[PDB]
Amino acid sequence: KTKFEKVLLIVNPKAGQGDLHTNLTKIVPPLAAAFPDLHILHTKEQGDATKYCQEFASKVDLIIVFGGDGTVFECTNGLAPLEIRPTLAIIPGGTCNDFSRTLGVPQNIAEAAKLITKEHVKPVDVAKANGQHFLNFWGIGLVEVSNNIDAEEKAKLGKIGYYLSTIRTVKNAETFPVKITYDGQVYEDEAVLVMVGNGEYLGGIPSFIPNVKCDDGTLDIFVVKSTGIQAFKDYIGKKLFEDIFHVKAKSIHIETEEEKEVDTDGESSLHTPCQIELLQGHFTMIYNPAVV
Amino acid sequence: KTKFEKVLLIVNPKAGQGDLHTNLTKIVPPLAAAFPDLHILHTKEQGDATKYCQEFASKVDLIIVFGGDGTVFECTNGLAPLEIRPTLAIIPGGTCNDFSRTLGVPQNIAEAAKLITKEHVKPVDVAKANGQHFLNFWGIGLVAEEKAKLGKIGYYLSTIRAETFPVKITYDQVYEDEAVLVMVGNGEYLGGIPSFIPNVKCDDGTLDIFVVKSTGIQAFKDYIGKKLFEIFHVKAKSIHIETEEEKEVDTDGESSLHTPCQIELLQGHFTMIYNPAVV
Amino acid sequence: TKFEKVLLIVNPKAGQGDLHTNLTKIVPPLAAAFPDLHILHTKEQGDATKYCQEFASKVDLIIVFGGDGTVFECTNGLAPLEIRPTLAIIPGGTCNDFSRTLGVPQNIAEAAKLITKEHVKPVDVAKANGQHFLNFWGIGLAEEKAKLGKIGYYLSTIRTVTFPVKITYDGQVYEDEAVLVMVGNGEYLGGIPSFIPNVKCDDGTLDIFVVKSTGIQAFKDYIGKKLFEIFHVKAKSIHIETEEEKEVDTDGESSLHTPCQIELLQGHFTMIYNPA
Amino acid sequence: KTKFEKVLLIVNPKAGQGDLHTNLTKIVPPLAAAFPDLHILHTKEQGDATKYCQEFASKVDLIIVFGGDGTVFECTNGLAPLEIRPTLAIIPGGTCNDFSRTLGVPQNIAEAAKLITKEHVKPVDVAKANGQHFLNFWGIGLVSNNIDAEEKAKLGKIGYYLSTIRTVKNAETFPVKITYDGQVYEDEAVLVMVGNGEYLGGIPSFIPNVKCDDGTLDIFVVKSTGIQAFKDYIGKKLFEDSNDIFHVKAKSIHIETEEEKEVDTDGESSLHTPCQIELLQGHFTMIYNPAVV
Ligand SMILES: [Mg+2]
Ligand SMILES: [Mg+2]
Ligand SMILES: [Mg+2]
Ligand SMILES: [Mg+2]
């Protein structure tokens, strides 16, 4: 009894603060004891994880990634476009690790590795925006680092985490027109933030978009109107994330007046306009049934 | 001197009218003689060619496909999303074989196979519409079994002798009108004959937008009749197309794309075997 | 089908070196029948051995297009391994002894077709001091020599052409002056049915055949007559000693010499054959 | 700046007394930190290590085996007959681990793993007897109670023989003929060995001055008249030449007995006499400890 005859572990050697030998002591032995056919590849350059996923997708039954949101995103882009997509698992090696939290994965990396040996798997929806896949979110209006301190915190927290840490003090925020068509309906207004969420955690903490699930077959649209800046600041302060326009939809189109740059799970070249679709149960992933 | 240390040949056994042994007699010996490491896989089901491309892309230097537009499209979708994409070649095994004609590939399959042994390669642009790739075309307004023989676009051309719709197109500017046909072309041949969209090249780094206005139905019918291919038509790299309702889109083969669409061009995305004598 | 994946090893010099024409004859029947077929050409001596060793765990059938020497490279490639896929021969030399043992037609298009019928049988492989063989082991054996092979050449000239030997075989002993000592596994030697009578490549024993020093003239006549029915016995475990080291001839190029311990590996290969 | 782009680690999960997780904690992290392409396969049955070697020999640049003399022998038989033979390394996971000691590999398994990361390699001769390869020895003339049987498994065949030879009462004598590089030895013997390893039975070779890379093999024969002197020789552990004990170096060897006698070697096998024995000079490249040599 195993679901996974062959396993690949992709290691970003800079993950877990870059203490490589110590990180491998924590994660490899549980996996090597449990999985009698285990291949371990370190990345060297940006894109390597994507390439490994595309090369090994037809060869292994499980791909485990040790890395932060960026490494996980490389795997998302590697596997999502393929016909054959093995189960994916995350050992959280950044500071944010949003999707791992969505899957209930303990942030202790030794514990994350042990969890994978339990082999609990569930289907997970993958979103697609103009042919660009994501697991956590799509957003405009999340855009300001003055210095290394700020830049180190921004890198540590992630784009969304950083935005949340500073939104309560962001004086005079940029407003913009937006048109959103969703399952035959329309929303048009002046906005300060537009999000489409798939992850149950954003910025390291439960999604500020209420009641997001990564496997319910719909996406969540969340818009902060130009008149709602203070109410959103207060809402973020209180951390009570119950239902500013917010609706669930499967097929979404978002237009702005000018082409605006889009933020998503990691580095990308998306901009508006965007057509956004959902691929239901597209990935199977290791998760923690006790917590999630 | 060889550019291709390892070669994969994907065979759709139903191609070339399905006379499998005879077709293999024509195509395999020239390839096996020229390429000392040659792997031959037959497809069995829809999607197999896509799977083979994705499994072998990191393993071989050349993938040859023996099949019609649909098999070629499966290879286009297999390879286009990947980081590593080996050279692709086509042995035309359907009735239309548009992109093979774009590459100057002789429709004689033995000759197409020999051509590959010459190893003439050129970059080819690949288009992408909302994450769906194509080599020949994207279109809306393209609407008896001769339909299967000719292909969607070939069939449309055979019968063009009424439905209008609103369309908005943003390109690099804006075009807004009532239309009967909207095309974005990348292939030099459509429906088995030279593109009715004038002066299309698959490697010039831009796409061609071609719109038949609601007032232009008769002029387009006459234009198609005359076969002088020289109505709004413009070249652009980044394109967005909106309709009033979600309209189904036709492309190189079977697909689920619909409007609205963002269309991009990936310059030189593929390298492909071609015939430099056809000029 | 018994063969999900197939490898075809091509020696491009086989079949007189008319490569394209030879591929027209052999590849289409195989490619039509086997939907996963990988074709590799050899370039240097030893390539066929390497290919067999690399692909033995990956494919279910290995077909070799080549003469006795190419077949011997495959024999040496596969025989020492734990996992040995079925082997088939398309005869691309002049002699092709083991192909004849298997009833393979010498017409290469017809040999290729036969493979598509997938008739398979176990075949014994012999081993002498760690050197494997399919046809023969022997002591006492230029354009014509290369065409016919060592054993074929010997037979073509024996009618116009001595040493001490001790042979222990399954606990018994033979000791005499000899002119030829053979151990046969193949049913054909030198392109014609084995001059060692009633050899079978799959009966679980080897055949020892010794021409005594006094038997030269009788052996010449025996070869002339080609009725193949001096010492001949069947045995499984064999040791052969001479007074000095003598060089040994076998299926192809090798560095064997006496003394030799010879063993039989029963059913060691499975091979494509012609049941008709 | 590495010699090994791809590495395979073969794990016998019963090695190191079978504490699998703890053993992997000791050996895998150093290797995984040093080798950015590392494939780890566990054996399940006898023969698996042989099969893994034969499958991966053309695919990887280094094969590391974690296991005892038997697992190492499976690798020896896997790789030795092949045309392409990657470098081999041993992490000692049995009790004896003779060849690892020949290579100066520390018996501490975490230290053995670290050593591999240093990438020190040397050529090693591999012997071949009637097509059966070996690294340590070939021998003829080599369990009273549960104690004996337990100690036999712990020590290995040659280690066990050495632990009990001082007790053996009326040992079987047998006739033997040995031809070696054109010369001959014929006598009644109680033990005949051909040695290639520098350690036998867990301690330095009782055959004097054996080297695994000097291009010759060592023949060592205890005559029927020399039983007592050999017992005393083993007792004293001074393994230098001195006289009813025949010892010579040779490259091409043939050994004949009156009847077919069963042969013992590095691990389980079906060899018997008569035997032709050859040496394949530099046949393997192997990881070693140049500090201990
Ligand atoms: Mg959802
Ligand atoms: Mg163009
Ligand atoms: Mg027989
Ligand atoms: Mg030595």
Side-chain angles (χ1 to χ4, degrees), chain B residues 28 32 36-42, chain C residues 31 35-41:
Chain B
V28 181
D37 185 333
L38 178 65
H39 197 164
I40 306 169
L41 292 176
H42 302 190
Chain C
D36 186 331
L37 177 66
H38 197 167
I39 305 170
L40 292 176
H41 303 190

Side-chain angles (χ1 to χ4, degrees), chain D residues 125 195-196 210-218 279:
Chain D
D125 305 334
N196 192 60
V210 178
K211 297 289 166 162
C212 69
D213 53 357
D214 68 350
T216 58
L217 286 167
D218 280 75
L279 189 71

Side-chain angles (χ1 to χ4, degrees), chain D residues 171 173-176 178-185 187-221:
Chain D
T173 74
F174 49 83
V176 71
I178 303 173
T179 72
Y180 61 102
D181 301 339
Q183 310 211 238
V184 173
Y185 174 95
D187 220 304
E188 199 69 11
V190 67
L191 175 74
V192 179
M193 301 281 297
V194 179
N196 192 60
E198 300 173 26
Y199 284 73
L200 294 178
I203 61 166
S205 173
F206 65 81
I207 305 175
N209 305 114
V210 178
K211 297 289 166 162
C212 69
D213 53 357
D214 68 350
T216 58
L217 286 167
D218 280 75
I219 302 168
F220 183 92
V221 179

Side-chain angles (χ1 to χ4, degrees), chain A residues 21-39:
Chain A
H21 197 320
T22 300
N23 295 333
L24 295 175
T25 294
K26 286 164 178 181
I27 70 176
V28 182
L31 295 176
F35 297 119
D37 185 332
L38 178 65
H39 196 165

Side-chain angles (χ1 to χ4, degrees), chain A residues 20-21 24-25 28-30 32-33 35-42, chain D residues 20-21 24-25 28-30 32-33 35-42:
Chain A
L20 175 58
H21 197 320
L24 295 175
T25 294
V28 182
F35 297 119
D37 185 332
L38 178 65
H39 196 165
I40 307 170
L41 292 176
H42 302 191
Chain D
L20 174 58
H21 193 137
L24 294 175
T25 294
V28 181
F35 297 118
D37 187 332
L38 178 65
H39 194 163
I40 306 170
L41 291 176
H42 304 190

Side-chain angles (χ1 to χ4, degrees), chain A residues 69 90 95-107 122 134-138 157 160-161 164 195-215 220 239 241 264-265 288 290:
Chain A
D69 289 338
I90 300 164
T95 298
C96 184
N97 317 298
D98 275 331
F99 211 76
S100 76
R101 294 171 194 270
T102 292
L103 297 170
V105 177
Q107 297 300 287
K122 71 178 205 160
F134 64 96
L135 288 177
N136 296 316
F137 76 94
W138 175 106
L157 295 173
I160 288 273
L164 293 173
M195 301 282 296
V196 179
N198 191 60
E200 299 174 26
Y201 284 70
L202 296 178
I205 61 166
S207 176
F208 63 82
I209 305 174
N211 307 116
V212 179
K213 296 290 166 162
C214 68
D215 53 357
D220 282 76
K239 306 257 279 157
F241 294 147
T264 184
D265 301 2
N288 188 359

